[PDB]
Amino acid sequence: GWHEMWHEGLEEASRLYFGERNVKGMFEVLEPLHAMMERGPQTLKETSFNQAYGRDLMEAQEWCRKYMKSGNVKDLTQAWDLYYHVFRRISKQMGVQVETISPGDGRTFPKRGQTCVVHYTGMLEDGKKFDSSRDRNKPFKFMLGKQEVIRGWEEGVAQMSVGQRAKLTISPDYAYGATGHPGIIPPHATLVFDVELLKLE
């Protein structure tokens, strides 16, 4: 929906402008996204999106249009300041979110080459548990940085200190995506893991 379309679109428009110096391409990504705003929100989530980001997106569009008439890059810079703020806020509900359950030592973090020793419980977004190392009564061990584990763990556990317990809420893009894991994880599943970093080996 609107959250995912704007997140993907802002990223791609920014790759075209900043990465490829292609203003026309960036415009052609942004303009349809603004156009679909104009019918108004039609779901509760689109309404929430509009309330949160509608005004800033409308202003960003106005700076873009000022740019087409001035050719002054300062007007585009003002547009992207707004688009980036919207992007960062949308991003807080995607990827992986780390919420501390109990603090760690705040000083010892995973480093390259080390093995993380953790306890975890994985649940679907509703709360149905699908796996737990705590049920096997033994810690799970893995290494970060080599795509051994889903992206939400790669990014989430890397931020935890030894002794920390944290809740990782992982969007499907950062977990098992459209395929899921047959027999365990459905397609397009947001996952919630209760993870405790026990030690580094």
Ligand SMILES: CO[C@H]1C[C@@H]2CC[C@@H](C)[C@@](O)(O2)C(=O)C(=O)N2CCCC[C@H]2C(=O)O[C@H]([C@H](C)C[C@@H]2CC[C@@H](O)[C@H](OC)C2)CC(=O)[C@H](C)/C=C(\C)[C@@H](O)[C@@H](OC)C(=O)[C@H](C)C[C@H](C)/C=C/C=C/C=C/1C
């Ligand atoms: C019996 O229990 C399974 C774990 C189950 C599978 C099903 C899922 C619901 C789940 O229940 O775990 C689960 O809770 C889960 O989602 N996990 C496990 C805990 C870490 C986070 C997540 C995960 O990434 O699993 C991982 C997920 C399922 C698949 C990987 C996701 C990242 C992606 O890049 C990889 O592409 C290939 C595949 C599984 C793992 O954590 C194991 C450790 C890692 C792998 C299998 C791959 O990294 C593999 O790549 C060749 C390796 O290099 C390994 C070390 C080679 C050795 C011989 C294989 C070990 C296999 C161990 C299997 C184990 C303990």
